[PDB]
Design a protein around this ligand. Sequence first.
Ligand SMILES: [Mg+2]
Ligand SMILES: [Mg+2]
Ligand SMILES: [Mg+2]
Ligand SMILES: [Mg+2]
Ligand SMILES: [Mg+2]
Ligand SMILES: [Mg+2]
Ligand SMILES: [Mg+2]
Ligand SMILES: [Mg+2]
Ligand SMILES: [Mg+2]
Ligand SMILES: [Mg+2]
Ligand SMILES: [Mg+2]
Ligand SMILES: [Mg+2]
Ligand SMILES: [Mg+2]
Ligand SMILES: [Mg+2]
Ligand SMILES: [Mg+2]
Ligand SMILES: [Mg+2]
Ligand SMILES: [Mg+2]
Ligand SMILES: [Mg+2]
Ligand SMILES: [Mg+2]
Ligand SMILES: [Mg+2]
Ligand SMILES: [Mg+2]
Ligand SMILES: [Mg+2]
Ligand SMILES: [Mg+2]
Ligand SMILES: [Mg+2]
Ligand SMILES: [Mg+2]
Ligand SMILES: [Mg+2]
Ligand SMILES: [Mg+2]
Ligand SMILES: [Mg+2]
Lengths: 205, 85, 80, 82
Amino acid sequence: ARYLGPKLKLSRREGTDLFLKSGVRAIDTKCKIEQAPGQHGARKPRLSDYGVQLREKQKVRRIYGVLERQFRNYYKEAARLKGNTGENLLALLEGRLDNVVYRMGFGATRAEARQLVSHKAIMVNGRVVNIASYQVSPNDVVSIREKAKKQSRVKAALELAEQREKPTWLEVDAGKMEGTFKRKPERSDLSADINEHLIVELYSK
Amino acid sequence: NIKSAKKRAIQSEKARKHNASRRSMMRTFIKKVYAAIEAGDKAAAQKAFNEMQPIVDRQAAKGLIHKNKAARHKANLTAQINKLA
Amino acid sequence: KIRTLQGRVVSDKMEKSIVVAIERFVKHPIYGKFIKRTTKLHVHDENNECGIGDVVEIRECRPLSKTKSWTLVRVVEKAV
Amino acid sequence: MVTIRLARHGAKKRPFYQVVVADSRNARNGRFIERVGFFNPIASEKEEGTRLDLDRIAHWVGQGATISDRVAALIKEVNKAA
RNA sequence: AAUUGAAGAGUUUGAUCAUGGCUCAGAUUGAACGCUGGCGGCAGGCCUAACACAUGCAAGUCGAACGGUAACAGGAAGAAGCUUGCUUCUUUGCUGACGAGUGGCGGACGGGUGAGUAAUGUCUGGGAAACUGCCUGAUGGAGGGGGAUAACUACUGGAAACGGUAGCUAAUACCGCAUAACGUCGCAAGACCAAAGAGGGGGACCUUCGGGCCUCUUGCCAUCGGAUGUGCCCAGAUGGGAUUAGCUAGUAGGUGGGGUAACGGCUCACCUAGGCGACGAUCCCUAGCUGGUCUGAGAGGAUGACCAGCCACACUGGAACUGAGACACGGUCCAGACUCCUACGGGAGGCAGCAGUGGGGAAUAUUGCACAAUGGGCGCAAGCCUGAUGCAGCCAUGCCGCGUGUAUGAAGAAGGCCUUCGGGUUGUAAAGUACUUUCAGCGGGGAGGAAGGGAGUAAAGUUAAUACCUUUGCUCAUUGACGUUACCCGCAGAAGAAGCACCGGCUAACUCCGUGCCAGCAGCCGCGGUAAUACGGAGGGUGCAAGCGUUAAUCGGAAUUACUGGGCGUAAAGCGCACGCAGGCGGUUUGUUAAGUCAGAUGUGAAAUCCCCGGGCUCAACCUGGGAACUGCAUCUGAUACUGGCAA
Ligand SMILES: [Mg+2]
Ligand SMILES: [Mg+2]
Ligand SMILES: [Mg+2]
Ligand SMILES: [Mg+2]
Ligand SMILES: [Mg+2]
Ligand SMILES: [Mg+2]
Ligand SMILES: [Mg+2]
Ligand SMILES: [Mg+2]
Ligand SMILES: [Mg+2]
Ligand SMILES: [Mg+2]
Ligand SMILES: [Mg+2]
Ligand SMILES: [Mg+2]
Ligand SMILES: [Mg+2]
Ligand SMILES: [Mg+2]
Ligand SMILES: [Mg+2]
Ligand SMILES: [Mg+2]
Ligand SMILES: [Mg+2]
Ligand SMILES: [Mg+2]
Ligand SMILES: [Mg+2]
Ligand SMILES: [Mg+2]
Ligand SMILES: [Mg+2]
Ligand SMILES: [Mg+2]
Ligand SMILES: [Mg+2]
Ligand SMILES: [Mg+2]
Ligand SMILES: [Mg+2]
Ligand SMILES: [Mg+2]
Ligand SMILES: [Mg+2]
Ligand SMILES: [Mg+2]
């Protein structure tokens, strides 16, 4: 299921940082970013249309830590939903429980948040939820379990998450380790580099 | 043959012979009326119809000829007798 | 008022019987052109004196002999 | 002969019956005259655990249909929210 | 809310534009094969031989219908060796029950298969000349008799299967008679047809003291209904072939008789010569049909595996009995092929029911547990039966979910590969360090599917009856195959968990070495004849992931059968020309009809499935509430511009 492999390779191939590390380092020092992976690493700089479409799709997939089958299911759901397909897809990707935990900052990375969720450290609406792909809905309180609280992992993740982007679609107490999903992130609330309208055509090919 | 259905076989056989006897009796009584009509004797035809009528009526009640058939025989023979007379 | 049909006799000599052809204008399922079909049926009628090109009124009734479950009701005009 | 009975239509280990008016000779999930209501043995805390329209049940009962044990128990248990 | 819908590329030429074929990128499956393989949920699992089958099970149930004691669980009497009053042993049906037998109901349901069937079936929409076990409403009866038989005894034939002779006995078995209307036959007067009892309890008056008698429950008979099921008829639709054009004598129609529950050439006697067919008869090949499934923007194309409705069949051919209902899967009889047993005289058999075997095939599972739940058969009930059903076992066959750790980490370690020999890559990757234990494994706790049924009490109901019985409350013990259940808790430990294809273009991803038109690759173009990004190996990279790839099949792309939506001067394609039947189409003015056409209403279009809004399994798959859709068909009521008919 999971990737279970080198992380900087994905960022090097995609040409940008995908936030796969804590943040103290591993952005310029031990990355050799913008150099592509392998022997023919530098000696290459050309790409076709289909290449750029695939690259954007794989960039989104590697950012959110998902596989092709589940991503295709997400695309089908987004297309089914009435509205803008790209916005629906991005909202579906952002609504994942592990992604919401990472946004709240209880985990340094998507992998760490997913590990917490799998190891039963996150509760939703006063209940345990062991599934990482659980879909979070508006007006939902996401918090850490009472028992096993105050762990070194989350303790060392909060201060790092103290100031990276300050998401506006959810509330974070930063006290008792609780938050809230009050609204659904709008496109604006989410980057700008992703050309969702290329994934939409990739899945139309 | 393999389940206790041999009881059903025996019952069917005995009921078959019994019902065959009743059917033969009723058919004899019905056919003598037609013989009378062919002979053209009005009195004989009427007399043969009379004592025959209860036989068919009661065999219908017993569940062997059914009311519609019992009434069909009577209606046809009555029509023929009325035409002959 | 009861359900009935209308058609042309164009029937041959027969004892108290005639065949009628009901004309219907139906649309082709695929190509959409309107074309005419025919459904010949046998009709029972006593005092039968109908002609060839006669228009008759037909009505569904009890099965009267095989291939015969229709009887006439009225005749509108004659052939000649 | 017409009777009112249940029809298991749930999933494995999660039954969900539907009370139907069907001839007795037919199969459990076979043809039925009409569907009256449903029943969920997993009541849970939801606001809908069992529902059936008594109008048609009374119609069929007064027309000559019988009631299974479970259906009769459900009828006399529901009565009217009591 | 339930219409957010349409991509192209390679390949003919020195090059170009067309035309035109082939190939590829997508989706899907009851798949199979190769490599690999941790867990769980839901579903699926002989597509070929309707080939043949060892063994086990899959239809029994009523003593509250009746004779009865073959088992034996009690009791009593009597005879007795006596434990000395307690045991034992032969009778005894009083008894809780009950093998075998008569009788009633059921075996026509459930389950299996797709051989046959091209419309005698199926779908849609209608109809009249019919029946209908069990279940329900109403109105009325339930009187009195008879003759047998099984079982059971005494003999006898038999290897078995299975019998034969002579006697006795009961019934809700059987058969008269009484009774006859709203029922049947008739215009009417008239004639005629039925019945079974059983069980619970107990005052008064009488008993051959075995019960009458009162009451309650249930059961039986006749008619009219209801509902359900089944039978029949009509119209339209439902594959291919014209290198199949004529086919039909009971054939088409009529009168009369017969027959069926019912109409009907359904069947006979006679009379007429009719009937079907180019709008495709007859003949030949193939095929179960539908709701639906796949694909597609749609229209269309393919398809009918699972689920649901209908049809047909049960070793092959045929027939009928019983029954309400069969022309009957685990019934009967006859014939046939095959197999088996035999004491050689004679007999038995039908897995296309659930397991399972042989065989065929690329290919498809356990000779399992339980009637706990639902549903059926019998029964007043308890209860019995149920390979239906609920579960479990095997398979990555499919869809969905999770894991195979996380953070830090430069000496950019070693080794491998390349290297212009400066270095680059593998690569934060590894080692090291700091953390966690989902899922596996070990040990504990513990929902739900369970409603009912039973025993005992209170109230009401019925009645000569505080009885008995029914209904409604209450109290007491309970009823789980799954099941080492789901789920929760505790210990330890990165410990047990990643592979497959591809890298010349289409098409995402490049270098070295070996080989030298050889070995080999290959979906198409095509590579390889000493410097191969195309063969083999290595390093590196891309894609997918408990899966990956190949083969098989359908649709799409294919506007490449073009109705939506194509063409014929030269690319395929105008008959050598003409006349003409059927057929198609048809100038203009008015009236009428209302067929085509259009509008509204009613009925219908099963459920499931698809879609929209919600709810429940820890999310999803999955399950489920409501709606929409179900584009159709029929009837009725209107419109009269156009097409059609009639008239001028
Ligand atoms: Mg048994
Ligand atoms: Mg017995
Ligand atoms: Mg059946
Ligand atoms: Mg009797
Ligand atoms: Mg009498
Ligand atoms: Mg006749
Ligand atoms: Mg007929
Ligand atoms: Mg298309
Ligand atoms: Mg078909
Ligand atoms: Mg019969
Ligand atoms: Mg049978
Ligand atoms: Mg069998
Ligand atoms: Mg089998
Ligand atoms: Mg083989
Ligand atoms: Mg998966
Ligand atoms: Mg329990
Ligand atoms: Mg490329
Ligand atoms: Mg070389
Ligand atoms: Mg096409
Ligand atoms: Mg063309
Ligand atoms: Mg010419
Ligand atoms: Mg001409
Ligand atoms: Mg004109
Ligand atoms: Mg009209
Ligand atoms: Mg939900
Ligand atoms: Mg639904
Ligand atoms: Mg429907
Ligand atoms: Mg006109």
